[PDB]
Amino acid sequence: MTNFKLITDTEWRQRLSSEEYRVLREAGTEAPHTGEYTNTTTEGIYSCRACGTELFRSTEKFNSHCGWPSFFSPLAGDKVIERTDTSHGMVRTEVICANCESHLGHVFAGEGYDTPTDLRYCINSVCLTLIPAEES
Numbered sequence: 296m297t298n299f300k301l302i303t304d305t306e307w308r309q310r311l312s313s314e315e316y317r318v319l320r321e322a323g324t325e326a327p328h329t330g331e332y333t334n335t336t337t338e339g340i341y342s343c344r345a346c347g348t349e350l351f352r353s354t355e356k357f358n359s360h361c362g363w364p365s366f367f368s369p370l371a372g373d374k375v376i377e378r379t380d381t382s383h384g385m386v387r388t389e390v391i392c393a394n395c396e397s398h399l400g401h402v403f404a405g406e407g408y409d410t411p412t413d414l415r416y417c418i419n420s421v422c423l424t425l426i427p428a429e430e431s
């Protein structure tokens with residue numbers, strides 16, 4: 296749970312997937328089907344491949360399986376940070392990992408999903424790690 300910013304480039308390469316390295320570093324992209332080990336059969340807790348934080352949990356998850364699915368409020372917002380970017384006359388809320396710059400995903404508000412947050416998080420697209428809660 297140490298500061299990931301101090302990590303060297305080599306450590307990052309030998310820490311996570313090649314796609315995760317560029318994607319996490321500068322939000323290079325978020326294209327799935329880049330890893331055969333990626334498994335989402337069990338529905339538990341989402342975990343950043345970079346560190347393994349509980350970014351998202353099934354409690355606010357509304358989907359079975361999809362390349363770019365939508366979610367509701369994360370575990371507690373402690374594992375992820377939401378910030379807006381005034382790129383132009385309009386701004387966008389980028390989703391990042393509280394432990395690393397996981398600016399690979401974005402979240403939209405006012406989607407109308409009849410939820411307390413009414414957010415549409417579009418992440419879990421670059422081979423994110425799934426934690427099997429139980430599903431017994």
Ligand SMILES: [Zn+2]
Nearest residue numbers: 343346392395
């Ligand atoms: Zn992370």
